[PDB]
Every structure is written in structure tokens, then in C-alpha cells.
Amino acid sequence: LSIPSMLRQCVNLHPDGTAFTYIDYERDSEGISESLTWSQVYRRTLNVAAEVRRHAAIGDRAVILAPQGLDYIVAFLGALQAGLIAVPLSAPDERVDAVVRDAKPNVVLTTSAISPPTVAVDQLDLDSPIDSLQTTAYLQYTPAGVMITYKNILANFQQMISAYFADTGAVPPLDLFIMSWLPFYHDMGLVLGVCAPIIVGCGAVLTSPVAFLQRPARWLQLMAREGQAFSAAPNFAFELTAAKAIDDDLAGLDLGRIKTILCGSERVHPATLKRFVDRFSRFNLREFAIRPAYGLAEATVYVATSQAGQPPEIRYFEPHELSAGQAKPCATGAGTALVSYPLPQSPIVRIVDPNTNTECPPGTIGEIWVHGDNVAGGYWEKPDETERTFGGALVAPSAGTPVGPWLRTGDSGFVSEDKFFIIGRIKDLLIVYGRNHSPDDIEATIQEITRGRCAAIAVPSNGVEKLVAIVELNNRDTERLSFVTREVTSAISTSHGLSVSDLVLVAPGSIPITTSGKVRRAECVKLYRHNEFTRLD
Ligand SMILES: CCCCCCCCCCCCCCCC(=O)OP(=O)(O)OC[C@H]1O[C@@H](n2cnc3c(N)ncnc32)[C@H](O)[C@@H]1O
């Protein structure tokens, strides 16, 4: 029923079984380990709940402001245990205090090392020998916090276990262990790192994303520990590992026991997936272990994924018609490549015209709408924004299609042969002469000339959008730069039929990224308009 009730059931069945293991690469370059059994985590969870009962009541919000690590886990788990609506955030910012005022928490859960009462859970006697809600568990973040219920989580996990383990009858192997470096304050990292261990019943090997960025090879190492690994990562993280990994760190590594590596949170590029398998197949990586996965925070986390026992399937479509709005399949190798996503059984996906609230015919591109019990009930204390995002109603629905409520994802997609495809985020698209061009395709054209980071943004000017590209380039003459500017400009002209209004050659690190690495094409637009970039001239 509730995460607290399942944790308590993990303690009954397997008191001394390992639950959470955190590898800390901060002091030692090769990492220091520490593990808790189900008994130890429950005990810390109970102790955090006691200190929280002293400051807040059932229904109050508890903001979690801690670095990655075991203390984050018992802070989050201690909140739900005391019947508080947890609020996972990142440790220090103005957009952190925007949440705090939107959520109005009655307690803050912090660490020594970093009006409402604040608790330092590290300084609490967490190993000292010795209620929950049943609807709203936590908010996932004008800032808008998604309301996630235990019914939301459980339903999504049931949809997940069924799709991810369809070839083994929705039963994961006895060997399974979760491995994640994803941050706990993000959709994927929190459900995979903190919740899945308890709901699934396996242990977790966890670390920080700054440790992965330092040395992306630790990801492969930790996955290859005893058992079958279940992990996840954004697309570019697959790139970063295929690039900056040394066969010396991978000395005598077995990757054949890996069970699932999810690729999600951003567009999945076939080019990136081929590099990953072509490079780590040497160490026995099974390619059907790579599972494209689509989702939103508004759906708890999961919407669709690739078939269980097969490697990712790739489809090909004519690029010219794609911009026109039409998906016309073409021969293998020709046109744009897109990862096929089988239309999910649960939740269900439909492609809808955002202007007429009516479904699109197959091959026609519209907005992705989602329906299912994993879809959240709305945004915390935001009635109007909840109506816009969650109040989707289908006009004259097709046979077998509910009329509502539908979650409007803001993503472009289409169906082709009972498979559906994700083009990209609508507001991030570039419209030029009625055609739609996606930044993921543009940057893929640049990212293969420069092999650095990019961002293809749309700057409005006197009634039209103009293509601007921020191109990170290595800093270590005034020619050579011309060869690159001229190279990329022509590569965008011939591959996309677009003119580059401005190419900003910046130093490495200039483009805004996340902690896991998603390029922030949103800020870039105003950093450009406010002339915040320094060019290599
Ligand atoms: C057995 C143990 C249990 C497993 C536990 C693991 C849990 C994680 C599994 C689900 C992974 C699903 C990605 C989560 C998206 C996210 O990270 O959540 P969120 O931050 O809300 O952003 C969402 C927005 O990102 C874009 N996006 C996301 N996936 C995209 C794609 N495959 N292709 C293209 N675009 C894509 C899209 O635009 C969307 O709207």
C-alpha cells in the first residue's frame, strides 16, 4: 500500500539483507563504501520520523535539502513515515527558495555540512535503538510541484515491471540489484534510487552524479558488481561513457550480467546507442539490455519502453515530410532515424491535435497525450495550471479511447504501424516557413562536426524565428575557427535546409547543463538575448 508499509515488510522478510550501499568518491579517488541492511534503514527512518514529529504534523510538507548519500534517503523515508508530504530538492539559490515558499514546509531536513525549523539529520543519533499517509507521498518539482500519490507510484511500478520484465513473466531475476548515479532530486533518480529498492525488494548501489562526471567509467564498474544490474541514464551520458572511458579501468570487466540500462529523460539518438554497444560489446554487453524509455514527472516517471527481449528497433522517415507534419517511412539508412516505441498497454498514448482536441490519423504529427492511473492529479495549490496540463478532453474519441482525463505532455510525436515516436518538446521547436525543425536533429549535425556540446535555439525577430546555435569548442588560431564555422554552417544548410543566423563559438562549459547533463535550451535563449556569451572571436 504505502512506501513505509513496504519498507516495514522488507524488514520482516529480510532483516539483515543489504538495502542501500553508497559509494563516496569525494575523499578517496576509488571510493569509500558503506551499506545498510533493511533493519538499519528502518531504524534510521524511524529515528528521523521521531525528530520530525516534534516540528510538524500529518499533512505538513518537509523539504529535503541534503547532498546525495544515505542521509538523503533516511530524510525522505523518515518524512513519509511521519505522514508528511516529502519535497525532494537539491542542496545549495533563488529557485530553491521559490519552491520553499510555494510548498510552505513546516520542517527542513538538512546536513551539518550545509522561519521553518531546520534539522541536521547527520547530527542525529540515527542508530539509536527504539503515522504515514495513504494518498499523497511527495511533491516533484513559477515552480510547479507534481502531486505523487502512493497509488500513482504503485501503478507505475506495476506498468514498469510488466514492460521491463515481460520476457520473464513480469518477475525480475533473484539476482537483481539497482545501480544509479542519478541525483535523488530528479524524476528518474528518486524513483530508481530511493523507492524502487523498497517497492521491488532488491538492494541498490548508489553514488553521486559529480562522481560519474569526474570519471564516467565508475558507472560501468559499479554495474558489473555481483548480480544483474538495473540502471538508467540520459542519452548523452551514454555518449560521455563511450568517449571518456579507458579500457584500463574496464580491465577484466564482465558486462553480460547487466539486466537493463534505461536510456531516457531526453531524446534517444541511434548514433549514441551504436557507439555505446560497439565500444562496450568487447566486455560482453548485451544489446537487448539497452531499453529506450519515455516518461514525464507528470506521469510519475514511466510511459513507454522498448520490447523486452529485443534490442532497440529503429525506424526511418523522410525528413522533408517530417517538418511538413507527416511521417513517411523510408528505406533503412535514408532520412531521419527515430527509436520506435511500442504503443504501451498501460498507460495508453494518443497523438492529439493541440488546437482541436481531436486525435491525429496515423502518420500525422500532433501532441502526445497520456491516460492512466500513473498520471498525477495536478500541481500543488495551482488549480489553473493543473487544468491546462491535466484536463485534456478528447473530442469525438476513437473506439476504445477514453474521453479524459488526458495528460498533455508538451511533446511532439506520431504513430506509425502501432509504434509511436517522440520528435521533441513542442516549445523547443524551430518553426521556419511553416516547417517544424527539432533542435535534437540540428545539434546532432553539429555534435558530429565538433564532438562537443551544442544548443540550437530559436530567437524571435520582427515576426519570425531565427536559428541560433551555441557551440562549445575546445579552447587550447583565427583560422581553423573559420574552417569550423564554415563547416557547421554548411552542414546545417545541407542537412536541414536552414540558415544559421548566428554561430556563437564559446569555451567548454559555457552552455547551461543539469547535474545529470540535459542541455538547457531555455536559459540559453536569454543568455543570448542578454549578450551573456563570450565568443572565441
Ligand atoms: C525496475 C525499477 C523501476 C525503474 C525506475 C527508473 C525510473 C525511470 C524509468 C522511466 C524513464 C523515463 C524518462 C523520465 C523523463 C524525465 O526525466 O522526467 P522529466 O524531468 O519530467 O522530463 C520529461 C521530459 O523529458 C523528455 N523525455 C523524457 N524521456 C524521453 C525520451 N525517451 N525521448 C524523448 N524525450 C524524452 C520529454 O520531453 C519529457 O517531456
Numbering used by the authors: 4 to 95, 101 to 122, 138 to 153, 160 to 170, 177 to 511, 515 to 575
Paper text:
Additional catalytic steps are acylation at the 6- and 6′-positions of SL1278 with two multiple methyl-branched (hydroxy) phthioceranoic acids, most likely through membrane-associated Chp1 to produce fully elaborated SL-1. These multiple methyl-branched (hydroxy) phthioceranoic acids are synthesized by polyketide synthase 2 (Pks2) using an activated fatty acid starter unit provided by fatty acyl AMP ligase FadD23. FadD23 is one of the 34 fatty acid adenylating enzymes (FadDs) in M. tuberculosis. FAALs use a carboxylate substrate and ATP to form acyl-AMP. The full-length M. tb FadD23, containing a large N-terminal domain (1–460) and a small C-terminal domain (473–584), connect by flexible loops and an anti-parallel β-sheet (465–472), was obtained.
To gain insight into substrate recognition, as well as to provide a foundation for designing drugs against M. tuberculosis, our research identified the 2.68 Å crystal structure of M. tb FadD23 complexed with ATP and the 2.25 Å crystal structure with AMP-PNP. FadD23 catalyzed the hydrolysis of ATP and connected AMP with palmitic acid to generate a molecule of AMP-C16. We surmised that it is derived from the E. coli expression system and binds to M. tb FadD23. Therefore, we interpreted these two densities as palmitic acid and hexadecanoyl adenylate (AMP-C16); the statistics and final refinement results are shown in Table 1. The fatty acids or AMP-C16 were bound in the hydrophobic pocket of the N-terminal domain. The backbone oxygen of Ala328 and the -OH groups of Tyr376 formed two hydrogen bonds with N37 of adenosine. The NE2 group of His221 and the Nα of Ala332 were differentially bound to the monophosphate of AMP. The OD1 atom of Asp446 and O38 of the ribose group in adenosine formed a hydrogen bond. His221 is one residue that attached to the oxygen atom of α-phosphate both before and after AMP-C16 formation, gets closed (3.9 Å) to carboxyl group of the fatty acid. The structure of the ATP-FadD23 complex is similar to that of the AMP-PNP complex, with an RMSD of 0.2869 Å.
